[PDB]
Amino acid sequence: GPLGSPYTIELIQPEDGEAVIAMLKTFFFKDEPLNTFLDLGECKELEKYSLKPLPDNCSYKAVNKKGEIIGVFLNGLMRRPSPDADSCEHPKFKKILSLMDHVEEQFNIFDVYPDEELILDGKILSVDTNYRGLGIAGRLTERAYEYMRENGINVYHVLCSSHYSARVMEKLGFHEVFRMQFADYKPQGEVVFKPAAPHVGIQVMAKEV
Ligand SMILES: CC(C)(COP(=O)(O)OP(=O)(O)OC[C@H]1O[C@@H](n2cnc3c(N)ncnc32)[C@H](O)[C@@H]1OP(=O)(O)O)[C@@H](O)C(=O)NCCC(=O)NCCS
C-alpha cells in the first residue's frame, strides 16, 4: 500500500507538461474546493494556468516507483507590484480568477515584507488521493526551500483555498497573514462561493525561510 511506498521528488521539466496536466485533471481539477463547488469540468484555461510557471524551474513532482506522478507543487516567482479574468471565456474559472484578483486588491503580501522584491509563489498543489496523509505535500513544499536558498529568496507565499493545504503550511511554520472567508466574499452583494466545510475561506500563508 501507499503507506510503505517510496517516491522521489524531482524538478518538473518542460516535456512533463502533459503528464502534469493528466494528473491534475484526475485530482486538482476535481477536488480543489472551488473547483469542486463549481464542478469545473473541462478547463483549458486552468491547464494553461498550470503550465505557465514551469519555465521558472521551481516546480516539483512526487513520483512513485512505477514512474507515475503522485503529487505536484507548481511555483512561480512573484514580484513586488507597481501601481500601474476579463479575457477568460470559461465561466466557472472566470469566477475563480476574479476571486484571486480580489484577494490581491485587498491584501498585498509585499506590505508585510517591505524589503523584498521577489517572493516564491506556490500556485498549484495536488496530491493523489491514494497517497494523502503521508506528508507528500510537505515534502514538495520543503523542496522549494533549496531553490529559495540558492537564489536568495526569503519568503514563500502560498494562497490556500483549502483548509487541508493550510494545514500543510501550518505544520511547516507558515503563518496565515490574511484570510478572506468565502461567506464574506460578496462582489455585487451576493455570495459567490460556498465550498464544503472545513474550507471556510482563502487562507494566505507565508513562510520566512
Ligand atoms: C491539500 C493536499 C495537497 C494535501 O496533501 P497531503 O500530502 O495529503 O498533505 P498532508 O499529508 O500533510 O495532509 C494534510 C491534511 O489533509 C487532511 N486530509 C484530508 N484528506 C485526507 C486524507 N484522504 N488522508 C489523510 N489526510 C487527509 C488531514 O487533516 C491532514 O492533516 P493532518 O496531518 O493534521 O492529519 C491534498 O489534500 C489535496 O490534494 N487536496 C485536493 C486539492 C487541493 O485542495 N489543493 C490545495 C488547494 S490550495
Author numbering: 16 to 99, 106 to 230
Text taken from the publication that reported this structure:
Acetyl coenzyme A (Ac-CoA)-dependent N-acetylation is performed by arylalkylamine N-acetyltransferase (AANAT) and is important in many biofunctions. Dat exhibits an ordered sequential mechanism in which the cofactor (Ac-CoA) binds first, followed by the binding and acetyl transfer of the substrate. Overall structures revealed that Dat was a globular protein containing a tunnel-like cavity, a substrate located in the middle of the protein, a CoA group located at the bottom, and an acetyl group between the substrate and CoA.
To distinguish the roles of the acetyl group and the CoA moiety in the regulation of conformational changes, the crystal structure of the Dat/CoA complex was solved at a resolution of 1.45 Å as a control to compare with the Dat/Ac-CoA complex. In the Dat/CoA complex, there was no additional α9, and the position of α7 was different, indicating that the formation of α9 and the shift of α7 occurred in the presence of the acetyl group. Because the interactions between α9 and the shifted α7 were critical for catalytic site, this result also supported that the acetyl group fine-tuned the catalytic site through forming α9 to interact with α7. In contrast, the locations of α5 and the critical salt-bridge interactions of Asp46–Arg153 and Lys192–CoA moiety were very similar in these two binary complexes, indicating that the conformational changes for stabilizing bound cofactor were regulated by the CoA moiety. Because the Asp46–Arg153 salt bridge was also observed in the Dat/CoA complex, we further concluded that the structural switch sensed the occupancy of the CoA moiety at the cofactor-binding site, which is different from the suggestion of Aboalroub et al. (sensing the acetyl group). The replacement of the bound CoA by Ac-CoA is possible because the Kd of Ac-CoA binding to Dat (5.51 ± 1.92 μM) is ~30-fold lower than that of CoA (152.89 ± 26.48 μM). However, in the case of Dat, differential scanning calorimetry (DSC) data revealed that the thermal stability of Dat/CoA was higher than that of apo-Dat and lower than that of Dat/CoA/Ac-PEA, while Tm of Dat/Ac-CoA and Dat/CoA/Ac-PEA were almost the same.
